[PDB]
Structures are given as C-alpha cells and as structure tokens.
C-alpha cells in the first residue's frame, strides 16, 4: 500500500542520492518550468551494488503487494532492464510494453495472465498508465504497478485513482528529501523549498 518497508525506502533514497541518480538543487533549479529536483534512475544500472539493492527491493515488495503475479512487464525502455533482472530472480516470464506498436506487448503473454508492470520513475504517471492500458487491451490482467521512485505529485495520485490502478514504490520524495537533509545534501531552507515544490510546481519559489 503505497510503498514497501520503511527501511527499504530509506536505504534506496540514500543510494539514489549517493550515486547521483537524483540531484537536488533548491537554490538553482533545473528547467521543465523550474524544478529543484532532477532524476535519472538509468544511472542505477551502472552500479551493481545499488542495482542489486533496488532489484531485490522490487522482488520483495512484489511478493508483499502482488504475490499472485505471473508475468513481469517492463515499461519501454527505462523499466525494461530492472524488469529483466526481476523476472530472472523470480524465475518468471518477462514481457515489455512499447510506447507504440511497430501490438505493443513484446514477448508472449496469454489472455488473463496476471501482470505487474515495472517503471523506474513516477512523475505524472502517464507513461506507465498508458503501458497499463495497452496491456489490458491486449488481454493482460494487470495487478498493478511498482516503481523505484515517485515525486508524489498530486496529479499522479489523481491519474492513478481515476484509472483505478494500484501503485507501489520502493522509495518516495518525502523520505528522500528527509534523508537528503540528514545526509547534508540540502539544508533547512532547501528542505522547505522542496516541500513547497511538491505542493505546487509553480509557486514554490515565492
């Protein structure tokens, strides 16, 4: 329900900040509009230790939230790598869902097969929600979605609520920024600026 172990969220957030999968710059934001946070979880694939922490994290939270799972599907293309390793560890069939046809489901999925979709980052959620929709159109019984990280944007919760799809994440914005402060990546000011950004990606610098 929402995430996995409180300690997994903490450890992963720690790792994301250390290897620089997540950058925090409250004082000099990047551009979209202006954002104090930037994330590329594809970086985690280059650090075996962190990668293993994340993939084991996936396997564990899947067993808790979606134990009935029969097929692991990765979201093209940032989610595929994680999904592959996950499927290997759990010795389950792997499939992957494309942005659009070249029939977006690659691999072999039988009608009704229970599927968990893997995503690396949840921002608005639109990408994975489209992957979910496509899988459902092709016959899959999508138990839900599991992602490495989420910005906890209200929009995302709204999109997921409306589509009725269950989402679980290894770590989250709230816990990451709390850890960021403790670990010295940001100061008091930065922390409040980051909280502001989550509540409104427009008036946080005001």
């Amino acid at each position: 329900m929402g995430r996995g172990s409180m300690t997994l969220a903490k450890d992963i957030a720690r790792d994301l900040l250390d290897i620089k999968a997540v950058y925090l710059k409250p004082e000099e934001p990047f551009t979209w509009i202006k954002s104090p946070i930037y994330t590329d979880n594809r970086i985690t694939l280059s650090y075996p230790e962190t990668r293993t922490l994340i993939e084991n994290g996936f396997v564990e939270t899947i067993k808790e939230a979606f134990p009935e799972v029969e097929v692991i599907a990765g979201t093209a293309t940032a989610g595929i790598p994680h999904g592959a390793i996950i499927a290997d560890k759990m010795n389950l069939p792997l499939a992957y869902i494309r942005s659009k046809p070249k029939n977006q489901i690659e691999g072999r999925v039988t009608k009704g097969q229970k599927m968990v979709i893997i995503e690396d980052l949840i921002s608005t959620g639109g990408s994975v929600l489209d992957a979910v929709a496509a899988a459902q159109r092709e016959g899959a019984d999508v138990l839900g979605v599991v992602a490495i990280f989420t910005y906890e944007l209200p929009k995302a919760t709204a999109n997921f609520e409306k589509a009725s799809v269950k989402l679980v994440t290894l770590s989250n914005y709230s816990e990451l920024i709390k850890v960021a402060k403790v670990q010295g990546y940001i100061d008091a000011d930065g922390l409040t600026l980051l909280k502001k950004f989550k509540e409104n990606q427009e008036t946080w610098q005001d």
Copy 2:
C-alpha cells in the same frame, strides 16, 4: 557447443523461430522473434548463461555490458547481473554511466545484416568506450553481415546460427529434406532460392 544445438532446439519449440519453406512469408522461408525467449524462464536462462560463458571465453577483460536498444537490453541486464558487472545501453546516446576507455561488450538479439549493432558499436566508441566486440543469440550467417563486420573490424560471436538451427529443424521434424535444401539456398541468395 551443444549450446548452439540446444538453443536452436528451444527456439524451434517455443516458436521463437518459425520455419515455413513450403510457404514463405511476406518472400522468406523463416520468421524470427527472439523477444519470445524472454517469456520462457528456462530457455531464457539457457541463453543468458550461454552469453556469460561465451563472454568469459571471448572477452574475459570485459568491464561493462551494453545492450542494443531495445531487444538486446533485457538479455544484457540479466547478463550484467549474473556477472555482477555495470550495465549500459545504446539508443538510436549511451544510457547509463560509462567511463572513458572502459572495456565494453555489446549484446544483441539477432544478427541479420548487422547494421543495427554496428551503429551501436560506432556510437559507443564515439563516446569513449573500448568495444571488445559483439555477442548475439542468433545469426542468419548472411554474407553481407560477415562483410560489414569484417570492414568495421568488429569481432562477433553468436550462441547459435542458421546452419545449426536448420540441421536441428530437419532432425526434429520441423522441415523435410526439401525444406532443408530450400533453406540452404536462401542463405546463399535471398532472391533465387525457390
């Protein structure tokens, strides 16, 4: 080894490879989709373990595994985990984090003309990677591919090939004596095989 044989066996049984010499597709007598292997745990492990063993023997000094977008990425990820090595992948430019001069082995699903991978190879080098070579699951053994690879001076290794697969197809009863020779002709020339 029996690896090429064993893999061909699997490819035919799960329908990753489809042989239809008496009624080609639209004209080819073979249809191949190895992304299908990803759905069969045991065949997938057979393949990934195959990759690992082949990589150890051909490119033991490998430092980073790179998958070709996007059919190669899954195989590369598993390979990289099994060998506890860093993983990166090339788009169509390198996703992940590769350091200058890092010894890389690029992973590919199928080798038809070998144009896709070679471009991936080219791009990787352009970004500072020392590509040791390429390893793919299967290859049609097209003369064009051998040429392309010979020119670009890139070493290639496959887990299984067209010749082995068709030989196995005959033995296993997927094709008869006529289909077999028809498949050999297709390899020699995609135009005048019939």
